[PDB]
């Protein structure tokens, strides 16, 4: 399955002028476009080799539309300030994410479109793509306004049509990078933290896409409660890294096994100390 995702962040700056607007576009776990309101460019820019192909119409259009996004968010900040009766001397944040997922048959699988205000769910399109989830009363006001204007229809038209179309286009053009799978290079490290304890760390490196699962078992018993699991992180070269660690009594190393699951592996991998 594949996905196209657009992310938008607008942060109000009391006194510092107009809000900071940042937009990014992703195909799966690969960014391809960006826009920064504070940049001298004032253009939608390429961030992937395979999007540079697109002609002037593409860039002009996306620039205009993303600027429209910036303006709409800019108004949204004031509107929401009104909804919540908030002061003009505090910074606030509006976030919007939307996009589409296609399945193995490269056809529409899912669609989404959601807004958050100050780190918190504000309004979201439901899975049926024709109703709204509003987390509070203000979001209910928004919901009334969007229902009266039939936003969900146009939105569904975008999600099921244009979004999928351009997703398939991008997937075709950047197939070398987007339609690839890099199996994780796995290993385990052992380092005494004390006379009686040792840190066992299970590593997965150079994998794509980012989805992966690392779990520790002690004599077959899952050890998630006592496992330090870091957030999957980018290597910088388009691949990802992740590790999971457990602190064990020295001498018990052979009881512990690491378990790695990734779509690049023909089957789940088990690493062990013997």
């Amino acid at each position: 399955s594949h996905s196209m995702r657009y992310f938008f962040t607008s942060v109000s700056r009391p006194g510092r002028g107009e809000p900071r607007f940042i937009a990014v576009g992703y195909v799966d776990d690969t960014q391809f476009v960006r826009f920064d309101s504070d940049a001298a460019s004032q253009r939608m820019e390429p961030r992937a080799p395979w999007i540079e192909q697109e002609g002037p119409e593409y860039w002009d259009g996306e620039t205009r539309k993303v600027k429209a996004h910036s303006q709409t968010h800019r108004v949204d900040l004031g509107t929401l300030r009104g909804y919540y009766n908030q002061s003009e001397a505090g910074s606030h944040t509006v976030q919007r994410m939307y996009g589409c997922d296609v399945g193995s048959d490269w056809r529409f699988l899912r669609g989404y479109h959601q807004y958050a205000y100050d780190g918190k769910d504000y309004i979201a399109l439901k899975e049926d793509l024709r109703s709204w989830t509003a987390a509070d009363m203000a979001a209910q006001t928004t919901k009334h306004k969007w229902e009266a204007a039939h936003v969900a229809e146009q939105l569904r038209a975008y999600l099921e049509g244009t979004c999928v179309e351009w997703l398939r286009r991008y997937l075709e053009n950047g197939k070398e990078t987007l339609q690839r799978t890099d199996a994780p290079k796995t290993h385990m490290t052992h380092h005494a933290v004390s006379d009686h304890e040792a840190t066992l760390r299970c590593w997965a490196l150079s994998f794509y896409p980012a989805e992966i699962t690392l779990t520790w078992q002690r004599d077959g018993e899952d050890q998630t409660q006592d496992t330090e699991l870091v957030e999957t992180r980018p290597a910088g070269d388009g691949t990802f890294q992740k590790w999971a660690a457990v602190v064990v009594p020295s001498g018990q190393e052979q009881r512990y096994t690491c378990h790695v699951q990734h779509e690049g592996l023909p089957k789940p991998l088990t690493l062990r100390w013997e």
Binding site: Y6, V66, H69, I123, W146, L155, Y158
Partner: peptide, 9 residues
């Protein structure tokens, strides 16, 4: 490409 039809909150 991104969505061209926008509506305020």
């Amino acid at each position: 490409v991104c969505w061209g039809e926008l509506m305020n909150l």
